[PDB]
Subunit: 247 residues, 4 copies
């Protein structure tokens, strides 16, 4: 019991929403959890709320130097991560005709390229420390649905799934698995503060089970993927959306 | 875990291999487990290997009367199942030119239709007992790979995935989820006694992770799918094959 | 406009609906087309309606003796098929609680097992002649959507996709390709006469493109799959539904 | 004459390889073809290889100014495109430990962001001209396979698939479809000059049908997707790889 005792997990974007919930669950599982977010004040509050097992370290996942500093600090405090959860992203609501190159570049730079930057450093850290590892990246079921008003975001999330599939092949020899989770619409802090909050009616209509998805619905699946129970799973995408789509 | 304390799980085809391991893990999780198999001697041995949480009840999943008797005995003993694992199947090795109608019908009748027979009765039992429930069906990653020497089997397993997707839609309103697992090649009792045993070299070379797949690799994933951690997952297929294919 | 000159194509279930439209297009492409249906009078009428090189031969795809007779007559009339289109199926509307074993068996027997019976005989006929043929099976996008009121049908169509993937592997060495098409809701004769006709409003609203799907939408895709332009495609499923789902 | 008579198709990266083959086939189908490549002299040479129906216009797809100038010229020559084929990309061979941020950014910038830049301008041009349109983007079956030595490329191609699915939803109302093709390994000019040339043994081993994939294998499928026969297909990905993977 406390299956993650002695393990260190980094969760990016963990100041609020799904990321905070993931960090809370991994901490309850026994892990030392690094709560990282570009919002430093938010990260501090999130780590404090989780208690004990959690430490806040601010980072911008799109900034290579910021990420290098993040991992240097983790190495000094813990000896290196065992588990990486790529959760940070911008979740936009943008009409197609408002998707210009500036918007596109920003979404790709954070959501896709930031994910690479963090994964590059994190898996290099696992390997240097001789740790079997787990990479878990939060994508989105919009990749399956073709959801409107998010074109750059859907592209970036498809990139995260592609990256995951290739990464699994590259890292298997190091005993590191790489999987993705595709949440459906979740009632996170960020969604409640955006026009996506108005999408619950349509989404629930398409779900096989009713109710608004919650951050804990995703956190509890990430817990499984971080555990030894998922040791034979790599390169896969697990869709968690009460059945809005079927993968 | 004990997370399944007070729950009842039926595992079909549990005399040996993957089914036995699934039964063993669900019992370790705390469930009362019904070990069912057409091989009554084997079911008895498997239940004895697991201990007091397991009870052997023989059944042929393709025989509606045999299945009715199975569920009547489960109802009398436990008040009804909470969890159904559809694991029973024939795993053939048959060259395409040896796939005649007799062979086709037999594989379809057990692997696909038997799965319906058991699921019909089992989910009706859950509903009658006002139980939230979990249906978990073992398919095969051959559905993704188009593996040779198993044509009727691959068809049947595609049918199980299709059935799972429709069932998730039909049963969501009764708080019952329906998911599938696709194992890759697993060193089960049945595989070891078949020409499929010689596929391990080629499969392991195509895997991202090293090693021959084991029954426990699948059992531990079914544990997750039977748990509350998977409560927001329905209609989905989780591929467990050390990366031979990517889903 | 004559790319199929010299080729012979068999289309099952071709008395009406999608089947007839497929037969009509392949005939326009220049092929000798065998219009086959369990409705013997209907098969004759549709072949006469198409004219060109169309000929009718009645058959029940679920009856191996009937199919044997079908292929004997085809061999005698044409020298054997180059192209097989598995289109015949029963399209039910049945509430889940009305899906009993009798219903399930019938749908699996015709839609899945009938597809095997025809494919067994048809691809054997191709091979006997040394032809680099084409197997194209009509499945359904309900396999992706988990559509309600069709549980046995969705299972059968998943079986057809599984069968297709395995068959591509088995027959590639004989230069025979095997692919599947998944239509969305189509305004066929059969659909117009069923409660499925009422699904058009919901379906069109979920489609990316406007309009009710027509049999010719599917026929024109099957034409491509039967042509040399599709020569490098095998084992694949092409979804044709104006974007209701994304495959 | 000629399915695409009166139509204008732009093919990017068309100086050599698959792009040249696509441009050639669309010209044979009757379209006026804009042969575009970052290699200006290469674009001129390829247009000359096609003949009177081709016009060469140089452009770097990753450069917004270059792409806008490309479309400004097309508008003056033809009144605007009906068909866009996003074919330009870098196809790298790079060991995982050589995948650094500079490499990642370059691949994403050209293969994914360039695809957006061209599609943004191209579909805006279709709409301004009041033309029903077809967008066809060339991805890669590495997205399905998780192919090694190409990690950024696999991510970028996953992005193209995601983008395609969202774009279909955004543009259906304007009667523009958007689909993707995933080629398997193809003996293109570019592959012949790279370490991927050494992959044919392994790839052919996994293929259901034997032989090295050729540019025409892809061109002939793109022809179908550009035609009216594909009018009911949008948001889909068509895999063209002699069965190396099954989609
Ligand atoms: N909520 C949903 O409906 C939904 C659905 C599918 C997928 N997702 C994914 O789940 C993840 C979390 O989503 P959420 O709804 O909880 O988001 P949220 O907006 O509530 O929180 C996102 C967090 O990420 C942080 N962040 C943003 N950019 C960052 C960067 N450059 N570096 C470090 N941190 C950064 C923010 O500060 C914020 O704390 C995201 O990957 C999102 O794409 C969400
Ligand atoms: N082992 C693998 O490589 C592999 C891979 C993918 C999927 N699977 C699936 O996993 C499941 C278990 O596989 P396994 O390798 O452990 O099989 P196995 O051959 O070792 O055991 C199968 C059990 O099912 C029972 N059974 C067969 N027909 C039955 C029927 N009519 N009614 C009741 N019981 C019946 C047998 O008696 C046997 O005890 C099957 O569904 C199989 O299709 C196995
Ligand atoms: N129409 C749709 O919305 C739709 C959607 C997805 C898939 N499909 C598939 O398309 C195919 C054609 O459907 P349709 O709507 O044109 O059907 P339809 O009902 O209009 O026509 C089907 C034809 O098949 C024949 N048939 C039935 N059982 C047969 C058997 N045992 N042997 C030989 N022939 C038999 C019937 O006589 C009929 O002529 C089917 O495979 C169906 O599952 C249809
Ligand atoms: N060849 C394969 O095995 C294979 C497999 C799967 C997918 N693909 C995809 O097919 C497409 C064509 O591949 P190919 O093998 O024919 O490539 P190739 O290398 O032979 O030709 C690529 C062409 O694109 C041009 N190009 C590169 N960057 C450009 C840019 N910034 N702007 C404009 N043009 C640019 C090059 O000048 C070249 O003429 C690519 O999208 C590739 O990813 C190829
Ligand atoms: C189905 C769905 N709807 C809205 C949103 C998402 C989603 O997956 C998402 O990831 O961000 C917003
Ligand atoms: C990859 C693979 N190889 C062999 C077998 C299976 C499989 O999935 C299977 O389910 O039964 C035998
Ligand atoms: C989406 C959808 N709706 C209704 C029907 C089908 C379908 O695919 C089908 O194949 O038969 C009826
Ligand atoms: C299977 C496969 N092998 C090598 C390559 C590709 C591919 O799809 C590709 O797109 O570029 C190189």
């Amino acid at each position: 019991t406390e299956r993650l005792a002695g393990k260190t997990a980094l969760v990016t974007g963990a100041a609020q929403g799904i990321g905070k919930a993931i960090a809370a669950r991994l901490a309850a599982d026994g892990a030392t959890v690094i709560v990282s977010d570009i919002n430093a004040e938010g990260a501090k509050a999130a780590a404090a709320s989780i208690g004990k097992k959690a430490r806040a370290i601010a980072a911008d996942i799109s900034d290579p130097g910021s990420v290098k500093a993040l991992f240097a600090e983790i190495q000094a405090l813990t000896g290196g991560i065992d588990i990486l959860v790529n959760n940070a992203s911008i979740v936009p609501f943008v009409a197609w005709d408002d998707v210009d190159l500036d918007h596109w570049r920003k979404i790709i730079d954070v959501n896709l390229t930031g994910t690479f930057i963090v994964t590059r450093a994190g898996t290099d850290q696992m390997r240097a420390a001789g740790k079997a590892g787990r990479v878990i990246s939060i994508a989105s079921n919009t990749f399956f649905a073709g959801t409107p008003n998010m074109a750059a975001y859907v592209a970036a999330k498809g990139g995260v799934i592609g990256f995951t599939r290739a990464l699994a092949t590259e890292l298997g020899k190091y005993n590191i698995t790489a999987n993705a989770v595709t949440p459906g619409l979740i009632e996170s802090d960020g969604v409640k503060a955006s026009p996506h909050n108005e999408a619950f009616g349509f989404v629930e209509m398409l779900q096989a089970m009713k109710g608004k998805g919650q951050p804990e619905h995703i956190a509890d699946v990430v817990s499984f993927l971080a555990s030894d129970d998922a040791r034979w799973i790599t390169g896969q995408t697990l869709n968690v959306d009460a059945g809005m789509v079927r993968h």
